[PDB]
Amino acid sequence: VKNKCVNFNFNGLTGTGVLTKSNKKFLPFQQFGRDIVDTTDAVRDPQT
Amino acid sequence: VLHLTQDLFLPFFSNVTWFHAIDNPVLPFNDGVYFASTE
Ligand SMILES: *[C@@H]1O[C@H](CO)[C@@H](O)[C@H](O)[C@H]1NC(C)=O
Numbered sequence A: 001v002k003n004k005c006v007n008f009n010f011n012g013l014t015g016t017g018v019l020t021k022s023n024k025k026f027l028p029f030q031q032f033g034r035d036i037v038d039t040t041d042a043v044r045d046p047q048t
Numbered sequence B: 001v002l003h004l005t006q007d008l009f010l011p012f013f014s015n016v017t018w019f020h021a022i023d024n025p026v027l028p029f030n031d032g033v034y035f036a037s038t039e
């Protein structure tokens, strides 16, 4: 479910937020995302 | 971002030995080794 605040458990990375499509350029080895504040910003869906 | 990491890296301007081939000596392995080859 996108554009709706929902608790997520993506591969054991529990949390809460809003999911959406991204234009980012994740490399094949990439799984996680972050920022200079070292907090998870984007995740790659294991099943899609 | 300018993420700073600490890990086993090959030093910059470090000293590397160049080998030829024409017998396959065994070289020590310690904290990782770096391998390069153009063929
Ligand atoms: C997950 O499994 C289903 C059924 O086996 C399959 O249709 C789907 O493509 C799989 N997803 C990935 C990312 O491989």
Ligand SMILES: *[C@@H]1O[C@H](CO)[C@@H](O)[C@H](O)[C@H]1NC(C)=O
Pocket (backbone or CB within 6 Å): B013, B014, B015, B016
């Ligand atoms: C690599 O070896 C040469 C000759 O043995 C030496 O002069 C040089 O200082 C070495 N490299 C470094 C980075 O010390």
